[PDB]
Design a protein around this ligand. Structure first.
Ligand SMILES: *NC1=N[C@@]23[C@@H](N1)[C@H](COC(N)=O)N=C(N*)N2CCC3(O)O
Length: 818
């Protein structure tokens, strides 16, 4: 009902009051809280006296910590080569606007951009590629011969596959980061355009270099050092010069410059623990204007009145990008560190750029003469996010109603960056780490001074609940300094902690591994579940005959002799639950591949898959709890469904089903005397069979050959630099606390009085070191069958915020490079 925005200056106050008067969003009232600086506004948000503000991407990390504890919620989205159904989304967004006479993207029946796009109110038409980018020079005015638009849509990777080394592409057609040559066994990494990355080509039999995912994005901004043409100094002569900065906490005015200085060995500075960066910079420059600095010389050149001088606020006339440009223009500084947005063609006569390679270049070369790319700012609020919904509603309705959000006659870059075109809601999962990305996050953590000093002799294990925390505390108090404990809410949180340098290793089931291997983490060890052979456990050199891995199979009755694998469309199938590997993922994947129609909701008959839609076919014949007529629990992902779990999926084939997708164990687990005292009382394993992939059948004990696929074992993973350490400690900690450990009377790794299946599955026999084989790391963990079956041997089969945080954003002018 109310949204309080925090303004840092009188000009932001004036613009905010203008928006209060003019912008009329229903059921939401805008209120303007005035503070004197950026930090004061962050504190006001932390105190609850304000609700939202806009921060430079450099301030997000320090915003996420004490004494602020803020999270980004609303950011400007960037166009990339990963956008799917872009035309439909842009057309919907344009139609949602409350205006008349604006470009509404015209799509075709399939949702693709029409080659010719027109603006009805103006009559101007132009040609456009598959991503909606105007072909240069094709804009035709009304009454003029339109440019004949071709269909520029063929991806460059698929164009290289034709006319043919045959590179691999994904389903959309983009370049796979890992490239494997078939004629010559070579593995290498490629850019977002297939351009080979230097230093990644590996001969065969050698382990391949881990390739990172790349996303080609457009309209990037950069941190640049503007300098007047009348001056003559270069970059390594910055010491003693007078400087203007946009802000002490902005990336375009401080952080990027500090990084470049320390990398070029230009800044005399020990470390963030030995000396603050402001001291080194105050000793580096003579007199400067750096709004927010706590050194007198770094504020001598600022032009703010008493009380307003050197504040992170437009009250200081030299604050911001345009403030730094004004400080340079009025000869109060020799160089101005700002963003590429402040550049203009009206300045290409007096000013020029200052490149870190000790050369000078015109402004138009900012893409090849800068201190680094600067991500867009973000609207942040409290980490508790009590007002995110209201702030988002207000901002979205203000954007739909064409309110003057990103412009003002009072000044530039007030409230938001004037270069901002559109604000979008970020996933509630996104914090500072996910927003900035792993590499930028670690850079900020190192610059602030929070960089964790690694210990090669202590492993920080991550727990996902309180019972695992108690077992880890036991293990740590008994380990003798070799084991420490960190807490997270879920395994993906543990992966994020490991990527943030806050944890060291974690056990992940297979359903979490694709993300982990995507973010660079490698399997340190694999769980060994072979209950019959302790060979590899007693002596690590012993070869693993079988890891005790579960084999997904399709169990059928010996009575039904028509159920074949080529005859699984229809019938009545059985699933252990939605999400489970053997009872859902493997069959759904095999079916979606072999049947190109690929609609499971209509593929089976009255299938029972707990977790689907209660009205769909995948929820019939699921008798939900026999003796509880006071509630309806059919198709529940819990024990309240008598069809959930392996036992329920087997009871499905017993009672009303024709085929049940289960691990191979259930057949022996609910049969042959070793079976419950109810429905499976006189059932025999000889009355059942398995469905093989070639369309035949076989006895149950043939699960190693007549299987749908194999399930990889749970993997304890860590960062690469830590593998040699982690394994080591693990090995030692097994010899003391394994199943045959020397001190097994003091602690067991695979058991606990605090619970069951904590840290590791209690059925785990031991932990076997991962044998890094010279192939694709996902091909080496999942294995070719599982990799191609679930993820199609593709680095693009899944998308999430964490994968986006581990993706390198390759800047480019446009996607026309195809
Ligand atoms: N390097 C390696 N990869 C394997 C095996 N060794 C190891 C043994 O697993 C077995 N035999 O089941 N463990 C795993 N998880 N993998 C992944 C694929 C593989 O069998 O090659």
């Amino acid at each position: 009902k109310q949204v309080r925005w925090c303004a840092i200056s009188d000009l932001e106050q004036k613009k905010c009051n203008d928006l209060v008067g003019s912008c009329n969003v229903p059921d939401i009232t805008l209120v303007c809280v005035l503070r004197s600086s950026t930090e004061d506004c962050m504190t006001a948000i932390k105190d609850g006296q304000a609700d939202a503000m806009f921060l430079d991407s450099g301030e997000v990390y320090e915003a996420s910590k004490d004494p602020y504890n803020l999270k980004p919620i609303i950011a400007e989205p960037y166009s990339s080569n990963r956008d799917l159904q872009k035309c439909l989304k842009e057309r919907q967004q344009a139609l949602a606007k409350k205006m008349i006479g604006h470009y509404i993207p015209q799509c075709d029946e399939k949702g693709n951009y029409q080659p010719q796009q027109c603006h009805g109110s103006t009559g101007h038409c132009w040609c456009v590629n598959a991503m909606g980018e105007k072909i240069s020079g094709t804009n035709t005015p009304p009454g003029q011969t339109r440019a004949t638009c071709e269909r520029h849509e063929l991806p460059k990777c698929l164009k290289e596959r034709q006319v043919a080394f045959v590179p691999q592409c994904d389903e959309k057609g983009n370049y796979e980061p890992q490239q494997f040559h078939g004629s010559t066994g070579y593995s290498w990494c490629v850019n977002a355009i297939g351009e080979e990355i230097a230093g990644t080509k590996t001969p065969p039999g050698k382990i391949p270099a881990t390739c990172q995912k790349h996303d080609l994005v457009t309209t990037c901004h950069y941190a640049v050092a503007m300098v007047k043409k009348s001056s003559a100094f270069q970059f390594n002569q910055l010491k003693g010069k007078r400087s203007c900065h946009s802000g002490v906490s902005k990336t375009d005015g401080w952080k990027a410059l500090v990084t470049v200085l320390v990398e070029k060995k230009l800044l005399s500075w020990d470390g963030p623990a030995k000396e603050s960066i402001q001291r080194a910079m105050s000793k580096f420059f003579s007199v400067s204007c750096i709004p927010g600095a706590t050194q007198t010389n770094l504020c001598k050149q600022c032009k703010g009145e008493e009380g307003k001088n050197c504040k992170n606020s437009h009250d200081e006339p030299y604050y911001g990008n345009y403030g730094a440009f004004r400080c340079l223009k009025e000869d109060m500084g020799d160089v101005a560190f700002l963003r590429s947005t402040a550049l203009s063609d009206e300045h290409s006569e007096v000013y020029e750029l200052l490149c870190p390679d000790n050369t000078r270049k015109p402004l138009n070369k900012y893409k090849e003469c800068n201190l680094g790319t600067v991500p867009a700012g973000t609207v942040v609020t409290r980490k508790i996010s009590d007002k995110t919904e209201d702030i988002n509603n207000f901002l979205m309705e203000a954007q739909k109603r064409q309110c003057k959000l990103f412009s003002s006659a009072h000044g530039k870059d007030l409230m938001f960056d004037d270069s901002t075109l559109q604000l979008a809601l970020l996933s509630s999962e996104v914090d500072a780490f996910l927003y900035l990305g792993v590499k930028l996050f670690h850079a900020m953590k190192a610059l602030t001074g929070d960089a964790h000093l690694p210990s090669k002799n202590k492993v920080r294990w991550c727990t996902i609940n309180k019972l695992e925390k108690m077992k880890c505390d036991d293990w740590s108090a008994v380990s003798g300094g070799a084991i420490a404990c960190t807490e997270a809410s879920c395994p993906k949180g543990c992966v994020k902690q490991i990527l943030k340098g806050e944890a060291d290793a974690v056990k992940l089931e297979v359903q979490y591994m694709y993300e982990a291997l995507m973010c660079g983490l490698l399997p340190a060890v694999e769980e060994y579940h072979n209950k019959d052979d302790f060979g590899p456990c007693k002596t690590p050199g012993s070869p693993a005959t079988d890891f005790g891995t579960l084999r997904a199979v399709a169990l059928v009755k010996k009575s039904n002799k028509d159920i074949n694998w080529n005859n699984i469309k229809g019938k009545k199938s059985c699933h252990t639950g939605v999400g489970d590997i053997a009872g859902w993922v493997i069959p759904v994947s095999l079916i979606r591949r072999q049947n190109d129609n690929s609609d499971i909701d209509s593929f089976f008959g009255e299938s029972c898959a707990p977790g689907s839609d209660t009205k769909s076919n995948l929820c019939k014949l699921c008798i939900g709890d026999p003796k509880n007529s006071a509630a309806n629990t059919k198709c529940s992902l819990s024990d309240k469904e008598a069809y959930y779990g392996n036992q329920g999926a087997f009871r499905c084939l017993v009672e009303k089903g024709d085929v049940a997708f289960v691990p191979h164990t259930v057949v022996f687990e609910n049969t042959d005397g070793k079976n419950p005292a109810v429905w499976a009382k006189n059932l025999k394993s000889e009355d059942f069979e398995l469905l093989c992939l070639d369309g035949s059948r076989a006895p149950v004990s043939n699960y190693k050959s007549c299987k749908l696929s194999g399930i990889p074992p749970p993997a304890i993973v860590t960062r690469e630099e830590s593998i040699s350490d982690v394994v080591r400690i693990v090995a030692n900690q097994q010899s003391l606390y394994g199943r045959k450990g020397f001190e097994k009377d003091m602690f067991q790794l695979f058991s606990s009085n605090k619970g069951n299946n904590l840290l590791f599955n209690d059925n785990t026999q031991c932990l076997i070191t991962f044998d890094r084989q010279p192939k694709d790391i996902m091909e080496d963990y999942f294995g070719k069958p599982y990799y191609t079956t679930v993820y199609g041997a593709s680095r693009s089969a899944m998308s999430s915020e964490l994968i986006s945080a581990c993706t390198i954003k390759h800047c480019s002018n446009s996607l026309e490079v195809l």
